[PDB]
Amino acid sequence: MDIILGIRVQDSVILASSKAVTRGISVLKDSDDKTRQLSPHTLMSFAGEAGDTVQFAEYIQANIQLYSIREDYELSPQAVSSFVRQELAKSIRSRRPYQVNVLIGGYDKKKNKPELYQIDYLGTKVELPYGAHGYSGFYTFSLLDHHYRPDMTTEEGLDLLKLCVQELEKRMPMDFKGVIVKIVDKDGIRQVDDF
């Protein structure tokens, strides 16, 4: 898939992911949701090779849901991200590796802190205030480097995100058909239905 962005503000993590699905010549869909809820306060967006993306995401989702039921407890975003990293690190030396890059946006209820983790298909994990995969960072990071403040509100985060998407829509050759935006905070996960 194409553009996935993430930004961690004061009290939430915001993930923006493109809606287009292109199979070579034609755009087959323009409303695709490139994300899975792993737990009530943890969201994962993804992009990479066709098929492997959803297969990997749903596999992770199933494993975290299994853990949640077994222990009657939600794993911290850090713990979930480490589990995901290991799976991708394991995968890279497999017979056929998962070609999947992910962003994990979670709200840690223990620490009362939002957390954003960026993990590529090699199992390269970094915790960031804002992140992206593919070429998305090339267009957006200069704007984020300038405007980002750790004490931003969710509304300010969304405005900075709009500026990033506008720059992408201007300078990117591909039409990614806009983005679905989701917010992760203390109350859980919700979708911004007008963006």
Binding site: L28, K29, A50, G51, D52
Partner: protein
Amino acid sequence: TTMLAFRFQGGIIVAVDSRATAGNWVASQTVKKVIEINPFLLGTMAGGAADCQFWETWLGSQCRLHELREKERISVAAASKILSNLVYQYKGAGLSMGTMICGYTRKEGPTIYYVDSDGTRLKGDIFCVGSGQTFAYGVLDSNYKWDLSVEDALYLGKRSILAAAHRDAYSGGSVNLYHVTEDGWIYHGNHDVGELFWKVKEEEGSFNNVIG
């Protein structure tokens, strides 16, 4: 090859062409590219003829075992996922498949899943696959509405394949139509493109570029 499937008020329309080529050589004009998985489920066939035939027939066997075990009609979601999970196991080995699994159940309503040999599984309202997919999409996109009648929807699917059959060298022969309802699919005949083209040209006034 050209195939389409779209959701509408009255269920699903499935329309396909009938041509099979081996290079420039037209091997057949009478190919069945819709597969009757069972009386309620349809599958389209693009890519490897054998891969689509074999595994969607197999899918019918898995759907039958499901309803024997669970005493309930299998969902389109579950049926499509059985196929996508299977081809995903073979990923890298060289399967070639592009299909739309189409069905109409109580809990789901009319549902279409695009399933593909690299593991893709997409739910959607309109899908078009094959060498002539771009031509069919053009007619579909400009004429599609949810509140189409069964009669008009059937024609739209027929007309969209005809558009592809005309322009795409590797699409043609005849058009097969299906209408998928909750009580099962209904076949709406084989339509020779040769005869259909002239009929549509006259009645519709389209294809003025072509002399008839």
